[PDB]
Amino acid sequence: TNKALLAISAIQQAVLEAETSERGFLLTGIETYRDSYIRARDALAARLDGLRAVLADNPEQIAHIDELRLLTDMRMAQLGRVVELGPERMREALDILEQARVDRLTERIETSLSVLTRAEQALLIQR
């Protein structure tokens, strides 16, 4: 369980890192920020794959991870589109970044991560 909570926090981290890196790239045009977005995106996928391996024997958790993953996939597709339009297309990139806001994927992911965290905490207590 303690291993699972670390993994959950590392997922939150990677999602924030992808967002902040994408914003940094739009702002500066410095490829280093794009690299960071790519790294965070890759790390997120890897951390999701591994968390799923920790929760393999818990159907309620597997379902919650499935749900988080849906949300993180939609969010990553949003950021990736903005990164694709990029600083060379500022107005387009901004229009899309702002349109993406209406889905509240960020809030929804944080809620999704809490459900997993609380469940592991409740779980540990029970056990």
Residues that bind Cl ion (CB under 5 A): 48, 52, 69
Of 82 and 119, the one with the shorter C-beta distance to Cl ion is 119
| Residue 123 CB, nearest approach to Cl ion (Å) | 19
| Residue 83 CB, nearest approach to Cl ion (Å) | 23
Of 4 and 93, the one with the shorter C-beta distance to Cl ion is 4
Query: Cα–Cα distances in Å, from 112 out to 74, 80, 118?
Result: 13, 21, 10
Closest CA to 72 of 53, 45, 51: 45
Q: What size, in residues, is the chain? A: 127
How far, in whole angstroms, is CA 30 from its chain's centroid?
Answer: 22
Of 34 and 72, the one with the shorter C-beta distance to Cl ion is 72
| Residue 116 CB, nearest approach to Cl ion (Å) | 12
| Residue 120 CB, nearest approach to Cl ion (Å) | 16
- Is 87:29 a contact under the CB 8 Å cutoff? yes
Of 44 and 100, the one with the shorter C-beta distance to Cl ion is 44
Provide the 10 A C-beta neighbour count for residue 63. 11
| 101, burial (CB in 10 Å: exposed 0-12, middle 13-18, buried 19+) | exposed
